[model samples]
Each structure stands twice: as structure tokens, then as C-alpha cells.
Target chain A: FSQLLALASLLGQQQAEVQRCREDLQKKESLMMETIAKIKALALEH
Target chain B: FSQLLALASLLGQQQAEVQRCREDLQKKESLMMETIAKIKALALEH
Candidate 1:
């Protein structure tokens, strides 16, 4: 989440670098959200 | 966050007390998370 803002603030620098970071953050967040959902769903499995 | 743990620990001693307090904590957490999200969203709005 903060990564997105940080990327936007990097506008003065390499745009591709910012884009890469955004993409990476997005992918990580997706994986994280999915894992959290799964964990909540299986809370009693522990 | 730690309150939840403490409340859960108080379970067997007084289940009703624990449950009532736990419910209150849940409500508080829901409200808190909502407010936090609003804050994050309004980072620049302020």
C-alpha cells in the first residue's frame, strides 16, 4: 500500500523502476491477501 | 490487540465476562480498523 505512494513519488526518477516496484508490490499484496483469507478460513485447522 | 489475548485467557474463570468483553473488543477493533483505513485513504485529504 505504501509502496504505491512511494512509487508515485518516484515520478522524477526512472518511470520503469517505479512501474516495476508497483507491479511487484501488487503481486505480493495479491499473494498476501489470498494467504490471509485462507488462514482466516482455516483458523480452526491449527 | 493484546486485550483480545487477555480476554481469551480469562475464558474459563468467567466465560460470560470473557465473552461480553470479547464482543466489545471485536466491535472496537472493527471500528478501529475502519477508522485506520479511512485515515490511510485520506492521507493527502488532511
Candidate 2:
């Protein structure tokens, strides 16, 4: 029973880590979108 | 014991979903990088 409890705890931590990864990806993608907009603006100016 | 098994199964599914999200992010980011490269090339041409 204790072993199962420990395993559950580890799994919970893994889930948290995965959530963080997802958030990081979202942030990067948002930044990329902003960059794309900037590139379009620059192209328009030229 | 059976309840633990069910919780573990759910956690496994969540992990898979997270993995998919990560892969999706990677694909988008890769495309964005390609766009940035093209933008740079255009700027150089001008």
C-alpha cells in the first residue's frame, strides 16, 4: 500500500511537470505569433 | 488496490495528452521558425 502511495505521488509530480511544459510551449508559440506579425508589418513598410 | 489502478490509468491518459500538446507545440514552433527565416531572406533581398 505504501509503495502504491509513493507511486501515486510520483505520478502527480509528473503531471505537474507536464503541465509546466504545456505552459512553456504556449508562451513560446505566442511569442512566435508576435514575431510573425512583426515580420508582416516590416514587409508592409518596405 | 483497484481504485489505485484506476487512478493510475487516468494519469497515464493525461500524460499522453500532455505529450500530444508538446508535439503540437513543436510543430507550430518549427513552422514559425521557417517563416522567420523566409522573412529574413526577403529583408535581405530588399
Candidate 3:
């Protein structure tokens, strides 16, 4: 039982880390899209 | 026992989801880096 509890605790921590990574990934993706859009516009201007 | 088993099972599922998200994030990051490099090259050309 104690071992199971420890496993559960570790898994919970991992889940939190994963969630943070996911959020960061989303932010990066959004930034990249905006940047690409700007690049496209610049390309068109030239 | 049953509750612990259920918790463990749920955690397992969550871990899988987290793994998938991480892989997707890595792929997107690589793509973004490549795109940024291309953009830089274009800027240098101009």
C-alpha cells in the first residue's frame, strides 16, 4: 500500500510537469504562428 | 485495494497522455526552429 501511494505521488508530480510543458508548447506554437504570419506579409511586400 | 487500483490505472492513462503531448511538442518545436532558420536566411538574402 505504501509503495502504491508513493507511485501515485510520483505520477501526480509527473502529470503536473507534463501540464506545464504542454502550456509552454502551446505558447511557443502561438508565437511561431504569429511570426510566420509576419514573415509572410513581409515576403509579400517585397 | 480497488480504489488504489483505480487510481493507478487513471494515473497510467494520464502518463500516456503526457507522453504524447511531449512528443508532439518536440515535433512542433523542431519545425518551428527550421522555419525560423529559413526566415533568417531569407532576411539575409534581402
Score every model by TM-score: 0.34, 0.45, 0.46
Best candidate, TM-score:
3
Candidate 2 wrong stretches, greater than 4 Å: A1-46
Model 1, B11: alpha-carbon shift in Å? 8.5
Give per-residue CA lDDT, model 3, range B1-46, as digits (tens): 4454455457557757877997898788668657655655555553
- Candidate 1 iRMSD, 1 decimal: 15.5
Which residue pairs overlap in candidate 2's backbone? none
lDDT of 3 by residue, A2-36 (tens): 45445545755775797799789878866865765
Which stretches of model 3 miss by more than 4 angstroms? B1-46
The DockQ value obtained for model 2 is 0.01
User: Candidate 1 residues B1-46, lDDT tens each?
Assistant: 4454454346435746655785797588568657655655666454
**Better candidate number, 1 or 2, judged by DockQ:** 1
Off by over 4 Å in 1: A1-46, B1-13, B44-46
Q: Give residue A1's lDDT in candidate 2 (0 to 100).
A: 45
All models, DockQ values? 0.04, 0.01, 0.01
Give the Å shift of residue A12 in candidate 3: 0.6
**What overall lDDT goes with each candidate model?**
0.59, 0.65, 0.65
